[PDB]
């Protein structure tokens, strides 16, 4: 009778095994209906050379009481199984048909008597390892056969698929989980990744937390192995889990190339929260540490740890870190990392931290606006800087704008009006007229576009420094559940490069061509 | 000044790398105090040739916000990290000092400076792989000091320390958990334990979970590698996840020495709970099935599975399943297995499944009472039936009596008052004069004897039929927290085995003497 299909907006990973290319609820089966067949077109353009198998899974049915709007079961391929998050759990699809040759029109066959009611069926799709990041797929269930009669198809699944790289998964080199990702392109065209190594669980400092980094020559196609930008072991003969240090922040001084790391190492405070753990005063034992690294050679190798909590935090202050993602370089070659700090009274603010030398020493003056968190700044115009801030109040960034690097602010007109946001990091960027194809000065803004949960993970673009957002100069890369963070890095002239917590890995990259964004 | 000592009454597993003997506590240190020596001393009569070692761990400090009446800042052994449950996370202890010989008086010793105010250390005891399950160790901390400074020793530490045997382990054989024990001896004096192997995590069905099997020919010191009683796969094509079978209860027919284990085996239902899930109807597409396994050959293998439900279960009931744990062979050589059906209005009841020609033909009769569930039956006098049953209602045990099998049951002296509970399975068994040590008719009842949580798992004796359980016939066995299900049967005549979920194992095995029980 009748079919519904879905072509989720999410990014088909090279590295994977599986990804999900169509999901199928059948919803009114009679017990003993098989789907004999159903027929697949890719577009003309598809480079289908790249796609290694696609393949047709039964998942069974639903659950009674779980309704008949839904498309799956149970998530089909995971981004927690420490076990396994690069092919289809095989306890809840069964693979009904395979194949290893891809044609623009595709049959996929299946012998399984349905049950009375939902039976859910989903595509998968495997990409060479080698697969360019830049490469779409136009894909449509065009023929579903039941009981040897076409049955209509339903549901919107037009979407332009795009790929990405799972960078890091949940369990990768023994680390249970992956947060809080930082990206910057060096002088060298270095793409360099920053995150949380959560070795043994997906909670917060305090625990056994490193800063990770991922590096890649190639435009995000390859990545080199995971190296340790900073760690803090058994300091003091404290244990590792009681000296986590993470929320990085990364910026390469355009300079001199020079790249730093700055970080919050939690030294001591049991198996809690340093958000509400963290106290007054300025010693290792009493609050959480302004920790910074550096690499002199295109992030191959890290300096030890340098202490800056004495230059920038006031003592009454609960807790001073970095706001984590990315830093920038100005103009006039002053180096700026976002921070937030909680107050005596446990209220947090959001502020810019600055280096006039190189990175020798740190200056912070006075914070933006109250009860904001995670900021990312840009340099909006020749020395004038936009704060774009975590608004605990809920439904939308905060906007700022400072030309004296934090001593005075005053609002921007886009403040609490034009980014919607459910509480998360959100990443900014500015790109120079000369440094991009389009040859206009641009913003670019990544967070999860929704004032409820962490999905939509959309980047977008303003011409008019930021005053106007056009719906038109935006792209959708993950509309399933994740957790939210992510960072953005122009890779070269034509394309911007994004790495954030993705519904498909913990640690995601993605490349999108500026003229994907900008009609 | 002062320190605080536990001594926590929890199993000493034998084929654990690390168990806590004792969490000491150093509530007000100046930063710089070491803890020089710390001695430790044992009982005359204790076996000390089967402890293979002692450690002394640093767990550094406490979060500011968590107070200053803790033994520990974490859970120091895990027991669902799938990667290790039988050493301490090293992430959280840091080994001060170790002893391979272990004299009545044993010193440990650190150089570790301490943190101003509050500072976790911890002894680890290591036991032989082959110490005897019914030895014991009785140890205090007699001298800790502090700058060379003998401090004053505070806290509740006499406890008389018990072994017990890891059976199965979270991450054991590729599965996250274990759940839902059963245990009986058979004819020839084989243990034989059942419990839920949960494959992708530690959701009751619908899932992934298979019946499975560990059998013991010496009273519990060594488990045979794990067999699989009872499965389903990929069952009429449907996922594995959509074919799960557990909350298994195993009976020995005490004529033939025929073990029967049942089971519930949920067919579809998306990945979604059972219990809210399976509908009324017969069918496997429509309801829970009552399932059953054999074994002739004492436990070694295991006959395909028989469909009970449509001897049993009436069509309007949204769930039928036996009762988790152990069925009996009563006197008369009647097989009964408890069960709990919920009926068209969502109400659970408790009663019993008897075959009178040794398990061809099943049959139930009335339920017991009203909004219960898990129950145990044990034949208290020739004839009679005392059926032990969780409440929702709360804070304790209903009891019932029946002489008919079920057709007509009657409240016991002891109903909903002699034994408290926070709702949740229990263990109930008989055990005949002429087959104990006591030479006396006993009931021995296990669950977690709290009206909250899942915690202080005790084994209580009744000698007048379950009409009064008195203080002085309990064993404590785990004060700390677990899932809470038991189960128990007597190994010979002398000593009672427990099969239980506990703080130190998914499945754990203890015996206990009978003399301990009744003093
Ligand atoms: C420090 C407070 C800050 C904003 C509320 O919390 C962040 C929120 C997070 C979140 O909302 O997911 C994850 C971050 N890792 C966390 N940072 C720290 C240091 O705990
Ligand atoms: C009918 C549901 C049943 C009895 C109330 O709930 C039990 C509670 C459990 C519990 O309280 O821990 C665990 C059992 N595995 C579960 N059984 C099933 C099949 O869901």
């Given at each position: 009778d009748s079919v519904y299909v879905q072509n989720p907006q999410i990014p088909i990973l090279?590295?994977?095994?599986?990804?999900?290319?169509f999901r199928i609820r059948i919803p009114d089966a009679t017990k003993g209906?098989?789907?004999?067949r159903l027929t697949i077109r890719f577009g003309?353009?598809?480079?289908?050379?790249?796609?290694?198998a696609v393949r047709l899974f039964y998942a069974g049915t639903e659950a009674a009481?779980?309704?008949?709007?839904?498309?799956?079961?149970?998530?089909?391929?995971?981004?927690?199984?420490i076990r396994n998050t690069?092919?289809?759990?095989p306890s809840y699809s069964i693979r009904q048909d395979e194949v290893t040759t891809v044609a623009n029109t595709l049959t996929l066959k299946t012998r399984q008597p349905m049950v009375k009611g939902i039976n859910y069926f989903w595509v998968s799709v495997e990409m060479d390892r080698?697969?360019?990041?830049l490469s779409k797929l136009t894909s449509t269930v065009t023929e579903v056969v039941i009981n040897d009669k076409p049955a209509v198809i339903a549901g919107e699944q037009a979407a332009v698929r795009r790929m990405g790289i799972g960078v890091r998964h949940a369990?990768?080199?023994?680390?249970?989980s992956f947060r809080i990702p930082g990206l910057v392109t060096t002088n060298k065209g270095t793409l360099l990744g920053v995150y949380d190594?959560?070795?043994?669980?997906?909670?917060?400092?305090?625990?056994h937390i490193d800063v990770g980094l991922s590096r890649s020559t190639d435009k995000g196609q390859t990545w080199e192995p995971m190296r340790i930008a900073m760690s803090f072991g058994?300091?003091?003969?404290?244990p590792s889990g009681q000296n986590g240090v993470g929320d990085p922040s990364i910026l390469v001084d355009?300079?001199?190339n020079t790249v730093w790391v700055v970080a919050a190492w939690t030294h001591?405070?049991?198996?809690?929260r340093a958000w509400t753990?963290?106290?007054?005063?300025?010693?290792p034992d009493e609050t959480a540490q302004l920790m910074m690294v550096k690499s002199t050679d295109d992030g191959r190798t890290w300096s030890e740890s340098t202490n800056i909590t004495s230059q920038?935090?006031?003592?009454?202050?609960?807790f001073l870190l970095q706001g984590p993602g990315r830093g920038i370089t100005m103009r006039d070659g002053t180096l700026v990392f976002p921070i937030q700090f909680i107050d005596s009274l446990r209220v947090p603010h959001a502020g810019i931290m600055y280096s006039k030398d190189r990175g020798e020493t740190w200056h912070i003056h006075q914070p933006?606006?109250?009860?904001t968190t995670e900021a990312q700044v840009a340099?909006?115009?020749?020395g004038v800087l936009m704060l774009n801030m975590r608004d605990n109040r809920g439904g939308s960034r905060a906007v700022s704008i400072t030309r004296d690097l934090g001593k005075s602010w005053t609002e921007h007109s886009?403040?609490?009006?034009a980014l919607p946001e459910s509480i998360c990091m959100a990443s900014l960027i500015s790109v120079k007229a000369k440094d991009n194809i389009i040859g206009k000065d641009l913003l670019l803004f990544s967070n999860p576009?929704?004032?409820?949960?962490?999905?939509?993970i959309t980047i977008k673009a303003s011409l008019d420094g930021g005053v106007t957002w056009l719906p038109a100069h935006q792209v959708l890369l993950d509309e399933e559940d994740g957790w939210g963070y992510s960072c953005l890095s122009m890779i070269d002239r034509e394309t911007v490069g994004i790495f954030y917590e993705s519904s498909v890995a913990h640690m995601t990259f993605q490349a999108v061509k500026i003229k994907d964004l900008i009609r």
């Amino acid at each position: 009778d009748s079919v519904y299909v879905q072509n989720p907006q999410i990014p088909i990973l090279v590295d994977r095994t599986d990804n999900v290319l169509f999901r199928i609820r059948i919803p009114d089966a009679t017990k003993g209906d098989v789907l004999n067949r159903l027929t697949i077109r890719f577009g003309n353009e598809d480079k289908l050379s790249e796609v290694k198998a696609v393949r047709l899974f039964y998942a069974g049915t639903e659950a009674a009481t779980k309704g008949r709007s839904r498309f799956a079961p149970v998530t089909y391929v995971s981004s927690h199984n420490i076990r396994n998050t690069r092919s289809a759990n095989p306890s809840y699809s069964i693979r009904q048909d395979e194949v290893t040759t891809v044609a623009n029109t595709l049959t996929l066959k299946t012998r399984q008597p349905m049950v009375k009611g939902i039976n859910y069926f989903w595509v998968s799709v495997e990409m060479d390892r080698n697969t360019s990041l830049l490469s779409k797929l136009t894909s449509t269930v065009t023929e579903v056969v039941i009981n040897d009669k076409p049955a209509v198809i339903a549901g919107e699944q037009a979407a332009v698929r795009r790929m990405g790289i799972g960078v890091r998964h949940a369990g990768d080199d023994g680390s249970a989980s992956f947060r809080i990702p930082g990206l910057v392109t060096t002088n060298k065209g270095t793409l360099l990744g920053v995150y949380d190594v959560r070795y043994n669980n997906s909670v917060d400092l305090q625990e056994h937390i490193d800063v990770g980094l991922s590096r890649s020559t190639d435009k995000g196609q390859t990545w080199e192995p995971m190296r340790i930008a900073m760690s803090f072991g058994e300091t003091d003969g404290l244990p590792s889990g009681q000296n986590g240090v993470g929320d990085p922040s990364i910026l390469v001084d355009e300079r001199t190339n020079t790249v730093w790391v700055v970080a919050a190492w939690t030294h001591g405070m049991g198996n809690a929260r340093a958000w509400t753990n963290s106290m007054p005063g300025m010693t290792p034992d009493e609050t959480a540490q302004l920790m910074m690294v550096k690499s002199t050679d295109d992030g191959r190798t890290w300096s030890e740890s340098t202490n800056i909590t004495s230059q920038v935090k006031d003592p009454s202050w609960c807790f001073l870190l970095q706001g984590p993602g990315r830093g920038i370089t100005m103009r006039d070659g002053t180096l700026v990392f976002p921070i937030q700090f909680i107050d005596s009274l446990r209220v947090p603010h959001a502020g810019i931290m600055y280096s006039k030398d190189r990175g020798e020493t740190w200056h912070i003056h006075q914070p933006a606006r109250t009860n904001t968190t995670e900021a990312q700044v840009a340099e909006v115009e020749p020395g004038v800087l936009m704060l774009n801030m975590r608004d605990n109040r809920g439904g939308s960034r905060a906007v700022s704008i400072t030309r004296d690097l934090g001593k005075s602010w005053t609002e921007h007109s886009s403040n609490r009006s034009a980014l919607p946001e459910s509480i998360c990091m959100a990443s900014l960027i500015s790109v120079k007229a000369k440094d991009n194809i389009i040859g206009k000065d641009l913003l670019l803004f990544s967070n999860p576009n929704t004032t409820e949960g962490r999905h939509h993970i959309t980047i977008k673009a303003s011409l008019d420094g930021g005053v106007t957002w056009l719906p038109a100069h935006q792209v959708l890369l993950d509309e399933e559940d994740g957790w939210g963070y992510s960072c953005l890095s122009m890779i070269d002239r034509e394309t911007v490069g994004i790495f954030y917590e993705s519904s498909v890995a913990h640690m995601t990259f993605q490349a999108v061509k500026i003229k994907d964004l900008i009609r």
